Design a protein around this ligand. Sequence first.
Ligand SMILES: [Mg+2]
Ligand SMILES: [Mg+2]
Ligand SMILES: [Mg+2]
Ligand SMILES: [Mg+2]
Ligand SMILES: [Mg+2]
Ligand SMILES: [Mg+2]
Ligand SMILES: [Mg+2]
Ligand SMILES: [Mg+2]
Ligand SMILES: [Mg+2]
Ligand SMILES: [Mg+2]
Lengths: 125, 100, 201, 51, 109, 139
Amino acid sequence: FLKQLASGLLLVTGPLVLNRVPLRRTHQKFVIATSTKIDISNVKIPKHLTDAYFKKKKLRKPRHQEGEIFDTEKEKYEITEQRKIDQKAVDSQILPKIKAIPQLQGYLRSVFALTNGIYPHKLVF
Amino acid sequence: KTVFAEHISDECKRRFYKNWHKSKKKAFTKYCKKWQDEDGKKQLEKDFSSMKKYCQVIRVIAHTQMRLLPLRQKKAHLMEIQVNGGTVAEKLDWARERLE
Amino acid sequence: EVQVLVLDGRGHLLGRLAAIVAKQVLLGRKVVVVRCEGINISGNFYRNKLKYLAFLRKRMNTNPSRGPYHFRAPSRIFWRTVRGMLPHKTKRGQAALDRLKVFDGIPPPYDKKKRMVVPAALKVVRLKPTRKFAYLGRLAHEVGWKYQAVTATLEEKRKEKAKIHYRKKKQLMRLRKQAEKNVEKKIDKYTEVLKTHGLLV
Amino acid sequence: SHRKFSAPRHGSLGFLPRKRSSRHRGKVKSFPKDDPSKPVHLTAFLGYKAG
Amino acid sequence: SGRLWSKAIFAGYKRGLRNQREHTALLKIEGVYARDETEFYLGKRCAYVYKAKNNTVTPGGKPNKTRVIWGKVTRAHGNSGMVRAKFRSNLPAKAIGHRIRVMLYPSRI
Amino acid sequence: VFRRFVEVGRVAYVSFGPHAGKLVAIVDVIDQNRALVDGPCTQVRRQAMPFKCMQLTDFILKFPHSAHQKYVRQAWQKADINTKWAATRWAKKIEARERKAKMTDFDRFKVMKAKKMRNRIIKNEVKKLQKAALLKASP
RNA sequence: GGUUGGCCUCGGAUAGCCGGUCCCCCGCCGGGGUCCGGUGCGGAGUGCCCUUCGUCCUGGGAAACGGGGCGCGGCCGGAGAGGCGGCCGCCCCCUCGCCCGUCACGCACCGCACGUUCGUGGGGAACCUGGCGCUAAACCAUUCGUAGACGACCUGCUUC
RNA sequence: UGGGCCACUUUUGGUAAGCAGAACUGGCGCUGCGGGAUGAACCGAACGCCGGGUUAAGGCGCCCGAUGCCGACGCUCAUCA
RNA sequence: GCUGGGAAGGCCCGGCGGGGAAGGUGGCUCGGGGG
Ligand SMILES: [Mg+2]
Ligand SMILES: [Mg+2]
Ligand SMILES: [Mg+2]
Ligand SMILES: [Mg+2]
Ligand SMILES: [Mg+2]
Ligand SMILES: [Mg+2]
Ligand SMILES: [Mg+2]
Ligand SMILES: [Mg+2]
Ligand SMILES: [Mg+2]
Ligand SMILES: [Mg+2]
């Protein structure tokens, strides 16, 4: 977790080289806050990483009225080189702090699952 | 487990048919070959050994001889007759030597 | 849960175990009770035999073949006790009753599996030690069950095989302890982690 | 009320389903109890009622 | 890669002995056998997932035979860890003794 | 057959109730169901306590019955029951249970990795021992 | 239509248990008697096992007497409902998979549900594709009369 | 409408009666609902169609919602409890 | 906040004491025990 945005959405990046999660928004209702943390104080999140930055883009049927000629092109969202630049900028100062403490990178690489014996109300996260 | 003998008589084989006239008399014709081929002989020996090891009571299937009677019927009567008086191995040896 | 719950009926009280089993099978769980001849009933044997004989007396005067069916196997006796606690005349209750399997002795499917125990139904904790009790196997045998002897012989045969299996398991555990004390320099690093987090005192 | 005089019931309920036998041969239904001390022997036979 | 939902059993409807309020359901969550343990699951989303004969649209996927009725845990029931749940449509009675999933989605931890 | 008795001075571990998890000393007995109980060094003031929530330990202090808390505390500190208790297998089983309960997600992950490696090494050595013990050619 | 890792097993006692070890008897393994530990069960079902992001550079440890075979062939065990399990021989493969690290990559689908398994699920027809194989009965009609209200039942019908 | 009946208590005749006859209040009749397994009258409570909360009388092994409390103290063994 | 302006309790070996005992400490006596 990096910061809370102006809309209350969380900005997260489990670094893209670890678990394929980019700089992404998420809702705090739908995340579990674990007790393990890293000191990401003194890392600089770029100022332009805002809700306007992360809002989805779309453009359909401006001049198109009757749908018989397919508009199913452009459905492939493209990763902007700006997004790649920002991902590298954030990761280049997040990853050194992750490697500081032992086997945290593997913990971030693994996913959370419920084993048939374990119960979330008994789990300490 | 049930083990039948080779060369079952026609009067006994009639018991297995409701219409022996229209029948082609195929009963036990593929079972009887296992008394002569090597793999079938091995299987029969294993059946007898397992009966010795696991069975508590053995019976012999025996049939009457219809042709010796003055009756109209030619279809033999089959029944299981219990073998008493001895160990299971002893009564299986007795029944095996009494087969046919 | 999703697995089959296998319970060992020895040392359990009839009605207590039947109530637990009935609730389990009504909750959609598959329950198998083995060794129903080891089930106990509180109260002395003559009293419980009198209860069963009074059950035997209840038959349809006009046609006993239509009348109540008195099952004499201990497994069927326990099954009928559970059916008394299920709503067996509805489809839901019949499905619950179908999710239950009862055996006298431990047949080969379940004699190789671990058997559970229900402490809330156990005679040792539920019954004062000064109280008398009856064995379901003896009660069934004396009200008409025919296979008490053969089940006893098969159970002793099974117990001999289980003793051999247990000796092998103890040998393996001794060998594992020897291996643990053998490879110790290359193991104490992870042993320390387990001890730090409370596994492996 | 009770029947005026006592009389034993007609017939036995031990043979109660007075139906046609499901078999013609007649089955044994109980062979003699086996004791292994005796010599090996057969326990039954089939015959035909001549007269 | 993993289950991510607690297993629950649809035990029945909220009821008296001779009256049945089908609009709310009782669930037995695995491992929760005390009333003081049910606090974690209050408000959690729960789903009854089943299969039917015709295909239906799947959000983020191609149509399959899987259907779902959504709901959520509303309060605790009794002393033994049962919970109450309100689903969008009252649960069918064929689901009694079957699986409900409690998804952790609106987490408070 | 019995090795532990309810007696004046017997230290008991409280298993449930308001004072669960603590140690106390039995000071007096009442009515076969309760005891006067005082843990002066374990933060349990003197009070009645049912025997049902007690689990007798192996430690016995020496003081007369219904002696004051000063003397009970002196007997507790002399031959200090706190350290002796912490050294027992019972107390460290309790401690292991507690620190396993407070295990976090990261600690669970690290425990899984360590247990993985430990079990693989142990089972490799087990296979080695079985293979070595299978070379038997003797009359 | 369900389901969303597995547990492959002593017997039991409860005013008692469990484990280990040296002497005696049972044809090299168990049963005793010592002795040594543990017992709010830690050789613990409040337990144990497995643990799934995938690859690429790239070191150290574990291993290297190692892993994977719907590959064949053989053997052994299991009968209570064995519907299962184990061991060998040859061959064909990678030296990888397990832990700690180096290294970057994969649609990063722009916060969102039915995701994730059992699963090559069960049942029913049908099409093509190869190998190995089989060539039957039942009922009616007729006949019998050990049978019989009718059904049903007992019987016979090109061989010495 | 002018056949009433039931219950607490008072009460007459009768051995008594789910009998016959009075007094008082309530009820059933005319009234569903929760509880008493079942039930005209007992206990709770009276009713437009619903959602949430909470109770009454009554309950909480299983049928069957709810004690799956580490409930408290005793008493009791019944071969018709 | 109130109460008996709570009751008990903790610490100050509470100190100068006085008294009462028993579910009797030490000591003494008697009877059974471990070198
Ligand atoms: Mg009257
Ligand atoms: Mg009227
Ligand atoms: Mg009115
Ligand atoms: Mg009314
Ligand atoms: Mg009612
Ligand atoms: Mg009644
Ligand atoms: Mg309401
Ligand atoms: Mg009730
Ligand atoms: Mg209930
Ligand atoms: Mg009486």
